[PDB]
Design an enzyme around this catalytic site. Sequence first.
Site, short mmCIF file in Angstrom:
data_model
loop_
_atom_site.label_atom_id
_atom_site.label_comp_id
_atom_site.label_asym_id
_atom_site.label_seq_id
_atom_site.Cartn_x
_atom_site.Cartn_y
_atom_site.Cartn_z
N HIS A 1 -45.60 -12.18 46.65
CA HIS A 1 -44.30 -11.62 46.58
C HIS A 1 -44.37 -10.51 45.28
O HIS A 1 -43.73 -9.62 45.25
CB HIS A 1 -43.39 -12.58 46.55
CG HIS A 1 -41.97 -12.13 47.08
ND1 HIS A 1 -41.04 -12.75 47.96
CD2 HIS A 1 -41.22 -10.83 46.79
CE1 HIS A 1 -39.79 -11.90 47.75
NE2 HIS A 1 -40.09 -10.76 47.33
N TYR B 1 -36.53 -15.65 50.53
CA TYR B 1 -34.95 -15.26 51.20
C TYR B 1 -34.44 -16.29 51.98
O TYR B 1 -33.42 -16.49 52.24
CB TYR B 1 -35.12 -14.29 52.12
CG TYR B 1 -35.98 -12.76 51.56
CD1 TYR B 1 -35.98 -12.58 50.06
CD2 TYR B 1 -36.77 -12.23 52.39
CE1 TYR B 1 -36.56 -11.51 49.81
CE2 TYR B 1 -37.32 -11.13 51.92
CZ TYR B 1 -37.35 -10.87 50.75
OH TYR B 1 -37.91 -9.43 50.31
#
Length: 303
Positions: free
Chosen positions: A121, A59
């Site tokens: 992730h 992000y």
Amino acid sequence: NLLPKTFRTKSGKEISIALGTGTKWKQAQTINDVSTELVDNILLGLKLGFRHIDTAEAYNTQKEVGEALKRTDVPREDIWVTTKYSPGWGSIKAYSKSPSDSIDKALAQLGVDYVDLFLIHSPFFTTEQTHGYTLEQAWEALVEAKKAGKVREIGISNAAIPHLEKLFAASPSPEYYPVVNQIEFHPFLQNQSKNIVRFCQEHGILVEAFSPLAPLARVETNALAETLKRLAEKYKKTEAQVLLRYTLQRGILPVTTSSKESRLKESLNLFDFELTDEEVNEINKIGDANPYRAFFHEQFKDL
Ligand SMILES: NC(=O)C1=CN([C@@H]2O[C@H](COP(=O)(O)OP(=O)(O)OC[C@H]3O[C@@H](n4cnc5c(N)ncnc54)[C@H](OP(=O)(O)O)[C@@H]3O)[C@@H](O)[C@H]2O)C=CC1
């Protein structure tokens, strides 16, 4: 009383629902710019009562979380910080040269001496994306970081059962098994892959839900709208608070985001009411008859 497996901050506080810093907040990786907009959002959540922040390498908001942790009056030890090693997706490859460099990079950008929870992730990558690392090798990096004390707890996100089994096998002992799986979960997708929730809960893995408000925020028509309105009316709560309570009653920890003070405050006010078993089952049933997946459609096709 909601979560079958749970954790505490270093100071010994309960891990709360997570404030997300991904999705609408994410940034291009080469940005060093802090988004004051996001920092203020994180500081706001912390003031309102969030004690769990979810971010990720991908992000590029670790730096904003780090700035908030410096500026906030809440002790760092009272906060749970979750972040993730991001191995890449479609065109995009891993930002870090190795999973181990990813963790050191998280400590540096967050400006912390330890992360509470560090996840892989996604298991959907090749070693070309990761610059030479398999899922087992990435898991070894997380295990070493747990042994070092860099990271308190280790897990994965978007894992199906076969990925969890590979992690169990790459663990040197039970103490090093994954203990969180963060997945998309909401009534229209109660199992992101076959039997995932039950499998995790039976093996001591806390399930976390991202996109738990998908019926409100993502879909064009919400088949649950009348049910959620009825329950909203009943409990004097919002339909979002109903969904987040429902998620917690299923034993799952929601990861949610909002840019609006009122919604943030409301996301936290879940502990003064309780859906009945039948209301939970109503949501389960209508939800299962109206499937909707927001993410990773090709990746889950046969899982
Ligand atoms: N591990 C993974 O691969 C993934 C992880 N995540 C993590 O989860 C986080 C949250 O994911 P996300 O999908 O955003 O989760 P949510 O389901 O909580 O949805 C976020 C959106 O919901 C809207 N919303 C909040 N309350 C209401 C309401 N009362 N009525 C209508 N809309 C509402 C918000 O808009 P507004 O701002 O206007 O309130 C916001 O845009 C991410 O930020 C990221 O941290 C997310 C996706 C994948």
